[PDB]
Ligand binder design. Structure first.
Ligand SMILES: [Zn+2]
Lengths: 306, 74
């Protein structure tokens, strides 16, 4: 029954919400379509920030994986918090005047709808390719970053299936096309998942470390402290391969190898008690603490431009 | 979607045992009392070979059977 920031919203409501928020906040939010899903559904992107010349950007997406409902819930919360507090708190005013945030509320829309009406734990896209009767590819194994080398299945029926080729999915090709086009302005890439309460940086497709590794580790350590400020929520952090697991073809690694020096994957609440089924009553607290983390990272990026 | 509004979720019939099924609308499959599911898949996990490095949901690994353990992909 309409949109709420403290409930999970079906796609039709989120879609309506993206237009509403643009219409209600014309100086701060505009909405774009960056492409179309396997099933032909428009994929929306919000640009949050005040008009300005040659603005650097931070790209954040939610809803890679269908069942991770708290992820889209957070992109929505972020947009409201940003506009609500613009011109009222000095940090956020500065951020939106000097930076744009691209916010992609649900990438895997076909999958998201599927979890609402059919199968709550679906993860992948809903595509079909020649050669298999199984459905769906893992969008976070589908990027050109050590594609399908470790931590990815070659079996089309598996949850970590990498696809027939990198960017085989319209959704990931649409995201990669957008970032490639805006590469010279995008300074950070942030991709929101759940669960397990972690902040992860490259690399997941191999055990190597970025040239930047010490700085990334220090930034992660500092932002999880900031996150813990509010409600005491404990996050761990580190390079993906050893901290979570090997996982080739990830969007975080791909973005980093494009030259985006600040590239993180967030894993939100909880640690497994509810898992993917995070109760609606925890949405606010989760989103509040996560907002502090994103703000902290954005402010750091503003002082470390390149 | 009544099923989801009430705090449950939809699942295929084969994944929701009889005692866990609910009467609420919203699903083209069936509304399931997810809190009553057990086993790896019932927790959003996937059974994998023992030598697959993953984040294991250890309490559900026995449900995966021989040579298999419960991984949750995040
Ligand atoms: Zn995920």
């Amino acid at each position: 029954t309409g949109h709420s920031y403290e409930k999970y919203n079906n796609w039709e409501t989120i879609e309506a919400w993206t237009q509403q928020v643009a219409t209600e906040n014309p100086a701060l939010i505009s909405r774009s379509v960056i492409g179309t899903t396997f099933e032909g559904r428009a994929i929306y992107l919000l640009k949050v920030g005040k008009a300005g010349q040659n603005k650097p950007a931070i790209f954040m997406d939610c809803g890679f994986h269908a069942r991770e409902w708290i992820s889209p819930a957070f992109c929505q919360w972020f947009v409201r918090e940003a506009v609500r507090t613009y011109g009222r708190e000095i940090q956020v005013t500065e951020l939106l005047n000097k930076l744009d945030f691209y916010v992609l509320p649900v990438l895997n829309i076909d999958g998201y709808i599927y979890t609402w009406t059919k199968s709550r734990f679906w993860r992948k896209t809903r595509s079909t390719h020649t050669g298999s009767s199984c459905i769906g590819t893992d969008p976070n194994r589908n990027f050109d970053a050590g594609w399908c080398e470790i931590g990815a299945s070659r079996n089309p029926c598996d949850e970590t299936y990498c696809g027939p080729a990198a960017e085989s999915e319209k959704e990931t090709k649409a995201l990669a096309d957008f970032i490639r086009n805006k590469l010279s302005s995008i300074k950070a890439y942030l991709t929101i998942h759940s669960y397990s309460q972690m902040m992860i940086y490259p690399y997941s497709y191999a055990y190597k470390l970025g040239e930047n590794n010490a700085e990334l580790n220090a930034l992660a350590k500092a932002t999880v402290k900031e996150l813990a400020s509010l409600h005491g929520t404990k996050y761990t952090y580190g390079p993906g391969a050893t901290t979570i697991y090997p996982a080739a073809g990830g969007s975080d690694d791909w973005a980093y190898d494009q030259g985006i020096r600040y590239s993180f994957t967030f894993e939100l609440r909880d640690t497994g008690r509810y898992g993917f089924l995070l109760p609606e009553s925890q949405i606010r607290a989760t989103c509040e603490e996560t907002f502090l983390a994103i703000k902290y990272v954005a402010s750091y990026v503003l002082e470390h431009l390149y | 979607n009544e099923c989801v509004s009430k705090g449950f979720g939809c699942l295929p019939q084969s994944d929701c045992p009889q005692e866990a099924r609910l009467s609420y609308g919203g699903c083209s499959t069936v509304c399931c009392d997810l809190s009553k599911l057990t086993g790896c898949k019932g927790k959003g996990g996937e059974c994998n070979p023992l030598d697959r490095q993953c984040k294991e949901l250890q309490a559900e690994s026995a449900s995966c059977g021989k040579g298999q353990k419960c991984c949750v992909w995040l």
